Symmetry: C3
Subunit: 307 residues, 3 copies
């Protein structure tokens, strides 16, 4: 698709990970993914203008071009390479097909991963999760991948669903679903069939949310986060909202518990501006919540350990 | 009132609870109640279009007519009796007494036909007519009410809860989530020996640490939307900050214990007071639809076991 | 400033704390402060129309003029002297300067304090914290003051920020920051340099929010509350909102744990009506939340003890 040309050309023009990064985690590359959502996708822009300091005492540094200098130990910097929006607006009114989104996402991820970057995708409908971990499995066939999936619903009963395809193709070592509260009968079958591990809302709430210290894991983890996992009071901008969800803080805490050798990638999606609750200054509530989730997600790619 | 005619005619035309329903809990009958709220009452419709799967792995099935087949499968049949007020049957607004007679009659019909009545919308007055209908049919049964609200709502002698307490139809009352308790409220509390669980007390104790609400008598569940924090359910008159999250309420509801459910009333929601998304979906509608669904699940699974 | 004349006229005409107040805590005086915020400031009016019963079975009684009768032992009344808005909305179109707001606040606070009242300021940008603590320090130089500061940010990296000024002038015995989740490197330096005690969001959440029983203290405490300490879902009406904050109930609980002999003053600020989320009937969500926080704040000024 010609809609992704300017973006994709800039991606494979990216300077590779320097030698000064050897044995260090990162760096992180960030791009905007808009499949299945309205053409106007403000989430990436909103995040880039958000404050850089995190919960844990570190600070994002954003760069539109390389080379990405590896920061010294004493400097709590976390470099992010902004690759901008995948879809170049005003390159036509054409809407990229699902397959075109997949190919565009697959290539960008392949390119970023090959150059030593941890890819973080922002926006869209979750299909980026499929193309991103397949790009990783292509480059690193021997690595075992486990996905930590935050979602109000399992979203695996449909054979065309991104997570279902990954399980069907046998590309996944394991899946940990977090926050489900709308589980269908078919969802339960796919659960038992693919031996999925799950932590539903009602269960983790009654055990105590802050009593979750970690999600133990030895394999490289992909972090897939549907905004629907949050309660509509925090993230209203989702199709078919499910009340009784995680607070933004709840989500941040569980994210911080993720354990593993490295982060293979991050997908933050499910956000639709047409569905958001807006302040009087026309700032959307869900964009506020996700901008924070994206930030602390990036911090995770830099600080994650097996224990 | 002629505004309820179409509805009431359908309710007493409802096929009675089959013999398959055995010694089982249920089934459930659902109707929309609009007393004290604007004519446009979208909560029932919004609930009907919501997904059917619950927190606990069961599934609502909605039916518009009998017979209600007793499921062998984790199905939970709900009989939709629709709105009580028939729109475009006149521009008239039913009086308080008309709303009372209508709900009383409907509840009486549904109850003795074996259904557990669930009322959605209105201002809480349905609680009065529903347990009075139960007490009329089951004079020997003792009734205890679990009442979720930001206010005790017993200072007014005309209150639905106060009338039931004054007529001595209630064995006991458990108030949950009160955070605006008046001096007059406290006097009525001690006089009727009401058990209460105020927000500040429940919170510092640990919300999730609430395992049970122990009880041996048939429970009525009365839920005012105002029990929830305005961040989750803003569509209430005189909102009180510092309330329950929707999840908090769902967890406390799940801890309710008892032999059976006499009825459920979900009210306090006014569409004119809601926070709306850009697509004009109301935040309070979202929260309440879930609470109704998990409330129905309670009528099917409640037990005396702690 | 002629904008504050009518207000100040009424304030220094206030009848002093009667002999009945004995050695009782209170009474409380309440005024509207609007520095750094839009001219229209509706928070005070919204509080005055709110229910007067508290969480802890006491009742606010609002009075527009003295003398403030001290209620009997068995009567759970908590008298509040409403001094109204500082800025008179019909004395001209002039916008008071920062210095004029400071001087006006300093004079009002001084006047109320020496008349035996505990001053509670509502609205503005947080600059009232500076002028009120200085007003108290002017009158009682021997008293040691500790501030309990609820905020999403440390807000001490800027040499002009109220909390930094107070620390630089050495008017503070100690500072307890609560709920910070956007801490900069500059913030960390000021923290260590001034021995500031802090309780950041991620920390207090993982340790158990309800498990916070008290904030032990022996010195008179000033309570400074930035609305931004609350999650945007509860208090959206803040400049540069930070997701993952406190629920209103979280804040109420932490406030209740605050210990001390007396309250030197209370400042509730950070609220901007232009940034609020509104119900269809045009009631702002942040106003609902803050109205409650103000009420339970007044309750603390009547019930605080070192135990």
């Amino acid at each position: 698709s010609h809609m992704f040309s300017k973006f994709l050309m800039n991606v494979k023009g990216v300077t590779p990970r320097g030698s000064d990064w050897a044995n260090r985690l990162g760096p992180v590359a960030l791009f905007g993914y808009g499949a299945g959502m309205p053409r106007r996708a403000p989430l990436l822009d909103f995040f880039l203008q958000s404050p850089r300091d995190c919960d844990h005492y570190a600070e994002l540094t954003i760069h539109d071009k390389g080379p990405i200098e590896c920061p010294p130990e004493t400097v709590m910097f976390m470099p992010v390479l902004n690759c901008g929006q995948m879809l170049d607006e005003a390159a036509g009114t054409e809407t990229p097909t699902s397959d075109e989104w997949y190919l565009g996402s697959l290539e960008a991820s392949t390119e970023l991963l090959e150059k030593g970057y941890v890819p973080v995708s922002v926006g869209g409908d979750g299909s980026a999760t499929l193309s991103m971990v397949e790009a990783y499995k292509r480059l690193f066939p021997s690595d075992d991948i486990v996905i930590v999936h935050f979602d109000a619903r399992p979203d695996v009963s449909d054979p065309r669903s991104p997570l279902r395809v990954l399980l069907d193709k046998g590309l996944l070592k394991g899946v940990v679903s977090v926050g489900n509260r709308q589980v269908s009968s078919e969802d339960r079958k796919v659960r038992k069939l693919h031996k999925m591990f799950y932590m539903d809302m009602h269960a983790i709430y009654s055990k105590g949310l802050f009593c979750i210290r970690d999600i133990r894991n030895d394999y490289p983890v992909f972090i897939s986060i549907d905004a629907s996992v949050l309660d509509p009071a925090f993230a209203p901008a989702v199709d078919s909202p499910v009340a009784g969800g995680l607070s933004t803080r709840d989500l941040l805490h569980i994210m911080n518990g993720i354990r593993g050798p490295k982060v293979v990638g991050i997908d933050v999606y499910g956000y639709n501006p047409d569905l958001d609750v807006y302040r009087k200054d026309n700032v959307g509530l869900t964009a506020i919540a996700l901008s924070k989730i994206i930030k602390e997600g990036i911090l995770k790619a830099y600080s994650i350990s097996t224990h």
